[PDB]
A and B are shown apart, each in its own frame.
Chain A
Amino acid sequence: LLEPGSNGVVRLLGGPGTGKSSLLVDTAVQHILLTGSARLRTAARAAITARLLVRTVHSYAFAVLRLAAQSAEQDGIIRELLAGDLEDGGWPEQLWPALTTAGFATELRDLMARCTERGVDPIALQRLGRPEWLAAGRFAQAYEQILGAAELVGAALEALGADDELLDTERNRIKLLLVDDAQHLDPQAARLVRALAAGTGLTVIAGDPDQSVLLRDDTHPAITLTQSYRCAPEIASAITGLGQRLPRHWTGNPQREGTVTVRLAASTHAEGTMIADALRRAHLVDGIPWSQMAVIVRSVPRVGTALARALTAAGVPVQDDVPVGRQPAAAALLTVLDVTATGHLDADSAVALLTGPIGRVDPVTLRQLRRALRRADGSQPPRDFGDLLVDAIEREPKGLSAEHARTLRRLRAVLTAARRSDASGADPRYTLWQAWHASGLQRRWLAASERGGSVGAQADRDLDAVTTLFDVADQYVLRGLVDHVAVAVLSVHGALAGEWDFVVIAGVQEGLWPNMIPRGGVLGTQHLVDVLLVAEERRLLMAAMGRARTRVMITAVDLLPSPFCAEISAWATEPPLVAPRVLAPSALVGRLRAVVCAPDARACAAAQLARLAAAGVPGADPSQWHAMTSLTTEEPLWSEPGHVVTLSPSTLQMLTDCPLRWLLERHGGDDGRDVRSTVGSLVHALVSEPGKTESQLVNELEKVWDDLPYDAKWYSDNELARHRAMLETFTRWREDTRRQLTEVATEIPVEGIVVEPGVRVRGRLDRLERDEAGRLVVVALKTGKSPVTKDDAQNHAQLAMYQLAVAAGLLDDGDEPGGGKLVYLGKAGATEREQDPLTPDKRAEWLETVGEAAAATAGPRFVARVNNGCANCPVRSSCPAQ
């Protein structure tokens, strides 16, 4: 039936992988076509050339349409039509609110497309009337009066049958018709093929009716095939066992030995781990190469996104998303182009260049560059870093430059090339390429992509993005240019052109694979499709299983195993795993260490760890364990005899509370300075002035309040109105007590010695005043809102150190104990908490407390007592007492 001398229509039927394409190519060669996919046609042409018109259905339709002459655009068109068809007053009067939405356009486009596929005229749709379909048909008929890839076959067929001479000429020009794909062909393509196969030669319609021209119901002789050539007998047995439930007999290759297995997890992580375990063991132990395994899942976004991430961590390669503009590497040149178009360097457009790939500096190098630049322009108020950056780029600062000169020189070269090349040539030929050549970002990745799997990956992706940007710029022909801009896990539908020794069918849960998710809508598209399913998904499972020839691994979790799993288990060749083993080199070391350091097999594990450590394998040697490290110093902070330590009065209530808090709050360990701190310091500075009136203080505060890092600019006015009242209440307090005390000094520096380890008090007294008795009270203005209690303010460590200094000289006065005061600006007047003067009895106790506190900062091994202030300290993650 397949000879050079032959006529009529013949077909070969049945069998997945049997060799339909091989038979077709053999018949084509012996007698001296169609493929159905732009990638499959390349393979067919390669096979034909190796043995010695490879087109597709849509390509053939386009070719015949072109001979007869002798997707965002359609979405935009329908969106514009919908936007126009809302001001005018035939929708069912309930779809008006949804017309402007972007979800209605896609549904309408899909309905139009499926109407086009089955060969339906707009008048035919208007004959179905359900006014939604009538309105859709009217919309379609209006759209026609206003081509795409969905109606190409229909348009080509419509152009045929009228000339009555082109069809005969084309038929006479074809001697062999080899469709090679008839199981899934649109009815328009089917009738086009039938018309093209009226008389010639031939006209092989092979296809595969088991998995949904025509095959099931037709005349002409048919050929039956039964030997699979690409499936083990066990796999075929499982497939047929599933098939004996469907509303079909074929044997596999006896020369193959196969295995179909079903696995169940206890969690999603367990499934994602045993899949990688099986893949790793298959690649390493069995020895099959990569690209022969594949993971098949119902939907990549639903499951495959997490599966790929959990699988690449185990060392199994994945062959594998963002726009061109959104890529920082491509946007690096876009920023340069924008700067060239504007002609002036901005402030926030320089940090991006200093941080992006053109010139790369880590944040610490940013701090070093900022410090080295601010050392040139020694203004008392430091200038903003962005302001100095542009000046440094333009004019070279001679004050200091050691290693930052190279980066600025490179940026100079790039900018001075781009800004001059645009004053002549066009954008794509003089802006992007000149900038790329001027930048050194071509000789680095070229010698850097060779080595390193981490830096090399970024280099490759960045180079691909740069090439794509260059291609887009070429297709765009300066302001307008900137304005314009391995194991492969894949879906079931993409799992139809693979050999795939090992196939892992992932995500076969009862909630997703038999899709109980309804497929209804507002337009009733599915009702139109059906008028004009478990058994449906079983065919998909069958097709996915049939791609594997050696091993099938059906993975699910127990999130519940579908009845398909129970059905498969009947023809398979244990409690669900909860701790699945891996072959990862970083998991063997972990398990071996966990078993060695446990409260027989220990010698074996130690031998394995020794053999691992003898060849690298980080984490194996005993010296590389974290628990085996040693303290760096273990020596006291100070040890010389006669040493004197300095205690500021503000950090004495913190040393008597938690010495570790003192050690780590100073010496770095405070994660920053809040705005409240600088506002309080500013108010203290304003109050400290001795010769300014209230209006002057308020004006000074208002003139500098603008430069404060307040988000919520409705709050930067509430704070100003509150601190104006703070200044006002300070002034009222000062005027209220003028007749009872009298100031002697303000912000007076306290410094001296109180014990001979010696203790050296140092501090800045906010306000020092004197009474009618000649004493010296001490005042510490505070801008907080919640005052301390009296029984606590009488034990305040800050004041009790200040009036401790005034005893035994120090502040150069009568050296009387005085008293103690604590004024809370903010919360009849400012609330004042008092403290009695240091009596000789209590002075000894306070000296003892100071001495005991000064001895807790001596050596290593600081104490960490739990306080009521543990909720506010930054050193909590490193605190043993938690």
Chain B
Amino acid sequence: LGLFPPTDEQAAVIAAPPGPLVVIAGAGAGKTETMAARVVWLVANGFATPSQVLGLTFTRKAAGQLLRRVRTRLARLAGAGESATVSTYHAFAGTLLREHGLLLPVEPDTRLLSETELWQLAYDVVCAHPGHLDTEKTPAAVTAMVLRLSGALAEHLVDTDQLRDTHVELERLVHTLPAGPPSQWLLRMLATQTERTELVPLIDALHQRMRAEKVMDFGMQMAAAARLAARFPQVGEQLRQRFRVVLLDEYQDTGHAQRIALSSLFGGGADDGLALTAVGDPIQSIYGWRGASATNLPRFTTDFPYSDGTPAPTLELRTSWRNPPSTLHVANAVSEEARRRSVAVRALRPRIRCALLNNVAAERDWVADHLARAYHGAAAVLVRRNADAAPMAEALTARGVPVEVVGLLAVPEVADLVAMLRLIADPTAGSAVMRILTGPRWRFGARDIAALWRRAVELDGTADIVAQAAPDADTACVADAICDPGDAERYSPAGYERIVALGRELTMLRAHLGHPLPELVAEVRRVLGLDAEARAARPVAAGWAGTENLDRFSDLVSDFAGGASVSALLAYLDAAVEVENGLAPAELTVRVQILTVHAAKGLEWQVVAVPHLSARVFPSTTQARTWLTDASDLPPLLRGDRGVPVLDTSDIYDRKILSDKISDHKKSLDQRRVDEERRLLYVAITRAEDTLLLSGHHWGATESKPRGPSEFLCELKTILEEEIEHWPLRDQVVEALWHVHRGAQLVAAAMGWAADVDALLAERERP
């Protein structure tokens, strides 16, 4: 219908008879392309009504694009010979809870918590625990463990009861058993195991408090929906009647809570007339730590049966479409080890520049040069660590290429609103005064800061020491010298008028502290220069948009106070800074992209480079801990989808055997993460469409000894050789010393915008 001619292999998937179906073979063989084109075949031909279609995707952008593609195809087919419902998994779980929330007793009016509010609630519950933890950690550091255990449990449906017998049956092997030849090291593992059962009451009280306040989380909604699906068969028999065709995209990364909720409503072996299609490959399953389900590709042929025991069919659909050769050879050779570990695919058939520089600066220069010579004379880069994203723009901006890189509270126009709101609330935050006193407004000099501090100190055993640190102790802050500057002989004449103006402004603004919260942040922004200087710092090519995030902050403040502005909205923002790493960047309208590998799933670009491929950075062997070292790890004996082998613990008669078993268990669990990293590299490579860039560096940034290139580079060099011949760290330290002027002259000499200006003048001068 005016689009691609469907291939012979895709033809079978396109017009497959109603019933469960699996699609495989991965990296460009036309999976999402045979979704709208299969909906239209099941709509225009017949067999369904386009109000009975349900499609599920992980990210909401994919849901939106699928909806748009489907509607466009349907509209085009309406001219030759009631709309679908497309939503993400968690949104559908929320809808299911809203419809049938009274069966399983959860109020349908239940609110959903963010990450910051969840952290605040968990922190209060942890700090309000009457008992004796007997742990060496701190609050806000065991909260980061409670919030992780309570996520893993609700992800694997464990309900905190079986967790109380985890250390038992294991501590006897280290005490009762005799040595064959305490070890001072197994005791650390035991002290870790005795931490889950120690903190079970914390994650019980947290759940109780969340229930008592009619709020839940992202990770509890799916658990509740799955329990509702499994317990009550009366909900599936209604949705199956409402929906006749169901599409499950990106099914490789779906979790365990979403696997028994999508197998109880649809395809529990109940109806063979429901056209149910699932797509995905077992090789691009990269998360492993979020959905924590390496299964669900093999557990489909026995999970959605024909209502008579026959396994559902899987169609190969092998053809390489989005991958040119000489970049598909690398993709099919770098993941050739999956011929044993995760066997569910055979191969796919078809329709490069590598560098090893001796330091990070040279590699940055090399990638920037290669990405500029294809721009100046006439794309994306995939960084695994987003902290590495911003660094590699200075070596690229100097080339002249326009630079696009992808924290709400760190924006220079919003960070001056969080301050001067912290200065108003408590006059003891000295870090919110140095930001105001030294900002572009009222640039105070060093001598005047010293004079202010001298006035501040002028204004000012073993029990007098503890007499401090009280909430009402005097600490000689600098915010009460602005309001009592003293005699105007210690400051500069130009620095006393500014001090008096600041004092009067703060005095006016502090009286507006009993007013409603949303009407205070909108008044400070009025008093400050914001909403005018924010626009004046924007290029003419942008247009009129200068207050996007500066307005979304006010919207978020109003959402929060739906409030005290001292106890709240300042502890809340400091919690959001450390927990959410800035609330939400307030994305632009929308150069070479910058995004991370995990955010580059199921997409395509022209020139894609995986820049940093040295050791310890891309494989990321650091900060990985098994289930026997940290408490919040959910031992595999009670985790769903048990890859993730379980140690037998029933064939040990001496301590040496137990030590060997533990060691090989740790080695296996580490090889699991290595395989996940290889899958990540496979995902990164196949997004090419064209020439590809692979690079690695010898000397990093903060290392006493050089680090070699990773195993990925050492394998890709062999692959390309069967490549650019590019095969005392540093002590330089950067330091910074503590148009507008030209354009101001025209305005100074001056004394369809004319109509607007005269209308505004008439409005202002008409009392």
Q: When each residue 112-141 of chain B gets 1 if its CB lies under 8 Å from chain A and 0 otherwise, what string results? A: 000000000000001111111101101100
**Interface residue from A104, A285, A612, A859 paired with B757 (Cβ < 8 Å):** A612
Q: When each residue 657-688 of chain A gets 1 if its CB lies under 8 Å from chain B and 0 otherwise, what string results? A: 00010011011111111010110011001100
Residues B753 and A604 in contact, CB atoms below 8 Å apart: yes
Residues A599 and B446 in contact, CB atoms below 8 Å apart: no
A286 to chain B, nearest CB (A): 11
Residues of B within 8 A of A169 (CB): none
**Interface residue from A610, A671, A862 paired with B750 (Cβ < 8 Å):** A610
Residues of A within 8 A of B95 (CB): 517-518
Residues A878 and B543 in contact, CB atoms below 8 Å apart: no
Which B residue sits closest to A306, measured CB to CB? B555
How many residues belonging to A are interface residues under a CB distance threshold of 8 Å?
154
Known A615-B765, A864-B735; judge A588-B753 contact (CB<8 A).
yes
Determine, out of A79-87, A377-385, A399-407, A548-556, the stretch whose residues face the partner at the interface. Answer: A377-385
**Interface residue from A97, A514, A670, A881 paired with B735 (Cβ < 8 Å):** A881
Residues A878 and B743 in contact, CB atoms below 8 Å apart: no
Residues B475 and A520 in contact, CB atoms below 8 Å apart: no
- CB within 8 Å: A-B pair count: 398
Report how far A618 CA is from B525 CA in the complex, Å: 13
B residues 682-736 touching A (CB-CB < 8 Å):
702, 733-736
B residues 460-519 touching A (CB-CB < 8 Å):
461-475, 477-480, 483-484, 491-492, 494-495, 498, 506-507, 510-515, 518-519
Determine, out of A470-478, A629-637, A792-800, the stretch whose residues face the partner at the interface. Answer: A629-637
Report how far A856 CA is from B699 CA in the complex, Å: 33
Report how far A414 CA is from B137 CA in the complex, Å: 50
Residues A521 and B99 in contact, CB atoms below 8 Å apart: yes
Interface size class of B (residues with CB under 8 A): 35 or more
A316 to chain B, nearest CB (A): 12
B268 to chain A, nearest CB (A): 20
A595 at interface by CB-CB < 8 Å: yes
Residues A629 and B472 in contact, CB atoms below 8 Å apart: no
Residues of B within 8 A of A38 (CB): none
Q: When each residue 528-539 of chain B gets 1 if its CB lies under 8 Å from chain A and 0 otherwise, what string results? A: 010111111111
Residues A578 and B543 in contact, CB atoms below 8 Å apart: yes
Residues A707 and B470 in contact, CB atoms below 8 Å apart: yes
Determine, out of B4-12, B302-310, B437-445, the stretch whose residues face the partner at the interface. Answer: B437-445
Residues B431 and A875 in contact, CB atoms below 8 Å apart: yes
**Interface residue from A603, A628, A704, A862 paired with B462 (Cβ < 8 Å):** A704
Report how far A100 CA is from B106 CA in the complex, Å: 11
A242 at interface by CB-CB < 8 Å: no
A708 at interface by CB-CB < 8 Å: yes
Which A residue sits closest to B533, measured CB to CB? A626
B108 at interface by CB-CB < 8 Å: yes
Residues of B within 8 A of A598 (CB): 539-540, 739, 743
Known A637-B447, A682-B466; judge A632-B495 contact (CB<8 A).
yes
A164 at interface by CB-CB < 8 Å: no
Residues B426 and A363 in contact, CB atoms below 8 Å apart: yes
**Interface residue from A356, A363, A591, A632 paired with B427 (Cβ < 8 Å):** A363
Residues B532 and A602 in contact, CB atoms below 8 Å apart: no
Report how far A182 CA is from B463 CA in the complex, Å: 82
Report how far A455 CA is from B457 CA in the complex, Å: 35
Which A residue sits closest to B126, measured CB to CB? A712
Q: When each residue 65-103 of chain B gets 1 if its CB lies under 8 Å from chain A and 0 otherwise, what string results? A: 001100000000000001101000000000100011111
Residues A606 and B750 in contact, CB atoms below 8 Å apart: yes
Known A590-B546, A611-B757; judge A578-B736 contact (CB<8 A).
no
B554 at interface by CB-CB < 8 Å: yes
Residues of B within 8 A of A98 (CB): 102-103, 105
Residues of A within 8 A of B512 (CB): 454-455, 458
Residues of B within 8 A of A833 (CB): none
Report how far A76 CA is from B587 CA in the complex, Å: 48
Q: When each residue 407-446 of chain B gets 1 if its CB lies under 8 Å from chain A and 0 otherwise, what string results? A: 0000000010001000001111111111100111111111
Q: When each residue 310-336 of chain A gets 1 if its CB lies under 8 Å from chain B and 0 otherwise, what string results? A: 100100000000000000110000000
Residues A700 and B449 in contact, CB atoms below 8 Å apart: no
A232 at interface by CB-CB < 8 Å: no
Residues A588 and B760 in contact, CB atoms below 8 Å apart: yes
Residues of B within 8 A of A587 (CB): 535, 544
A357 at interface by CB-CB < 8 Å: yes
Report how far A686 CA is from B461 CA in the complex, Å: 9
Residues of B within 8 A of A382 (CB): 467, 473
B residues 748-767 touching A (CB-CB < 8 Å):
748-751, 753-757, 759-761, 763-765
Residues of B within 8 A of A514 (CB): 83
Which A residue sits closest to B522, measured CB to CB? A313
Task: With a 10 A CB-CB cut-off, give which of B434, B447, B735, B759 has the most chain A CB atoms.
Answer: B434
B740 at interface by CB-CB < 8 Å: yes
Report how far A558 CA is from B765 CA in the complex, Å: 39
Residues B445 and A863 in contact, CB atoms below 8 Å apart: no
Residues A669 and B430 in contact, CB atoms below 8 Å apart: yes
Residues B748 and A583 in contact, CB atoms below 8 Å apart: no
Q: When each residue 608-645 of chain A gets 1 if its CB lies under 8 Å from chain B and 0 otherwise, what string results? A: 11111111111101100111111111111100000000
Residues B434 and A628 in contact, CB atoms below 8 Å apart: no
A748 at interface by CB-CB < 8 Å: no
Residues A596 and B551 in contact, CB atoms below 8 Å apart: no
Known A94-B103, A458-B515, A589-B532; judge A671-B747 contact (CB<8 A).
no
**Interface residue from B428, B449, B552 paired with A269 (Cβ < 8 Å):** B552
Q: When each residue 5-37 of chain B gets 1 if its CB lies under 8 Å from chain A and 0 otherwise, what string results? A: 000000000000000000000000000000000
Closest 7 CB pairs of A and B: A590-B535, A579-B543, A668-B478, A633-B445, A632-B495, A610-B750, A362-B510
What would 28 A/B residue contacts be, using CB atoms closer than 8 Å?
A98-B103, A101-B105, A102-B107, A285-B755, A306-B555, A364-B479, A370-B472, A381-B464, A560-B67, A590-B546, A591-B753, A597-B536, A597-B739, A602-B746, A603-B750, A609-B750, A613-B747, A619-B532, A632-B495, A633-B444, A635-B492, A637-B450, A668-B477, A708-B466, A709-B470, A718-B133, A866-B735, A881-B735
Q: Can you name 20 extra interface pairs (CB under 8 A) apart from A107-B102, A670-B430?
A: A95-B102, A98-B102, A328-B514, A362-B507, A367-B480, A368-B484, A370-B472, A510-B83, A596-B743, A596-B747, A602-B746, A610-B750, A619-B532, A664-B434, A664-B449, A667-B478, A668-B453, A714-B130, A877-B434, A880-B736
